[PDB]
A and B are shown apart, each in its own frame.
Chain A
Amino acid sequence: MTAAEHGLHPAEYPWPQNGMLSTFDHASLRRGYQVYKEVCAACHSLDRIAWRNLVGVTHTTDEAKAFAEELEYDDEPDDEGNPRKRPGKLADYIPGPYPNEQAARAANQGALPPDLSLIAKARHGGADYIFALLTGYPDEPPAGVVLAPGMNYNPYFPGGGIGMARTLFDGVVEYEDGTPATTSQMAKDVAAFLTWAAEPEHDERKKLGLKAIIVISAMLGLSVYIKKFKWSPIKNRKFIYNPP
């Protein structure tokens, strides 16, 4: 296929979580949630993440309960069997901006903004693809590209014409930690956040892997000693042949 049809492959950026022994930077995760909440959540759902998932990752229990309690969720019907709403609880999933696909497409000139809970796993490149895509809208499409109406040129997206417009501009977010909200900073943070959303076990997984590597390495070393020890009678065997 042409390179255009594949999309330009994103650079390998040095994410804090790259590295066998490296966790996510949780401060970046928290900043990235704030970017999700103030920019992406207008169009994109995060349906696989519950409020409880933020607790002890990006937010305290209290902050997350506050986020949940601001929203209304469908309760069990009342005693006359009429529908009711309740305030959110930590067990609730973060609610989407649109009630269904059709509503989502209608609001986005036919394109359906995907759920972002898995998007870091669901694209070649992961964090790097999300970072490259958000930051990779050129001012002007390369001369000769014909965009379909309601498409925007972005070389990282396969085919080049993406239904999502550029959305990160310097200072669309005001970070609560005083970090300068530059396009690149926000893209890095949100890309980190989405990577966490796709693989929330990441930090624990890598720590258990370290323990496993160490134990299994030692067992491998010892198994070699023990094999050699037990086999030495066979390896060391000597013969004398006297033809009868």
Chain B
Amino acid sequence: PDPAIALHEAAAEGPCHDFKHHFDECVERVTKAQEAEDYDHAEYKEDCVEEFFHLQHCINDNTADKLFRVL
């Protein structure tokens, strides 16, 4: 099984917890906003890409070296 799966999960719960929370909160908001009607006829549709990038960037910083060490 893929070593990356575990390392990414560990880094999310640990050193990247703040970023994990931001992404989570973001998704909650956006999904709820999509649930509401007349969302399709809004000007601005919020995404979670920014928060996702912050999280992924963080995970990668805490994982890259560990992952390549076990391949």
Chain A residue at minimum C-beta to C-beta distance from B52? A142
Complex Cα distance, B61 from A13, in Å, reads 9
Q: Interface readout for A166-200 with B: 1 if CB under 8 Å, 0 if not?
A: 00001000000000001111001000000000000
Residues of A within 8 A of B (CB): 2-4, 8-15, 132, 135-136, 138, 142-146, 155, 160, 170, 182-185, 188
Q: Separation in Å of the A167 CB from the closest CB of chain B?
A: 14
18 further A-B pairs in the complex, CB-CB below 8 A; given A4-B47, A145-B48: A3-B49, A3-B50, A4-B53, A9-B57, A10-B60, A11-B64, A13-B67, A13-B68, A142-B51, A142-B52, A143-B48, A144-B45, A144-B47, A144-B49, A145-B49, A182-B4, A183-B2, A184-B71
Task: Please give, as numbers and ranges, the residues of chain A lying within 8 Å of B1 by CB-CB distance.
Answer: 170, 182
**Residue among B47, B60, B61 making CB contact with A145, cutoff 8 Å:** B47
**Residue among B57, B67, B69 making CB contact with A8, cutoff 8 Å:** B57
Task: Please give, as numbers and ranges, the residues of chain A lying within 8 Å of B61 by CB-CB distance.
Answer: 11
Complex Cα distance, B68 from A11, in Å, reads 12
Secondary structure at chain A's binding surface: helix, strand, loop or mixed?
Answer: loop
Docked-complex contact B30 and A144, CB < 8 angstroms: yes
Secondary structure at chain B's binding surface: helix, strand, loop or mixed?
Answer: helix
**Residue among A138, A144, A155, A188 making CB contact with B71, cutoff 8 Å:** A188
B10 contacts chain A at the CB level, 8 A cutoff: no
**Residue among A10, A13, A143, A155 making CB contact with B27, cutoff 8 Å:** A143
Docked-complex contact A183 and B4, CB < 8 angstroms: yes
26 residue pairs bridging A and B, Cβ less than 8 Å apart: A2-B49, A3-B49, A3-B50, A4-B47, A8-B56, A9-B57, A10-B60, A11-B61, A11-B64, A13-B67, A135-B4, A136-B56, A142-B47, A142-B48, A144-B45, A144-B49, A145-B47, A145-B49, A155-B52, A182-B1, A184-B3, A184-B4, A184-B67, A185-B71, A188-B68, A188-B71
Task: Please give, as numbers and ranges, the residues of chain A lying within 8 Å of B23 by CB-CB distance.
Answer: 142
Q: Separation in Å of the A10 CB from the closest CB of chain B?
A: 8
Task: Please give, as numbers and ranges, the residues of chain A lying within 8 Å of B51 by CB-CB distance.
Answer: 142
Task: Please give, as numbers and ranges, the residues of chain A lying within 8 Å of B52 by CB-CB distance.
Answer: 138, 142, 155
Docked-complex contact B64 and A13, CB < 8 angstroms: yes
Q: Separation in Å of the A159 CB from the closest CB of chain B?
A: 10
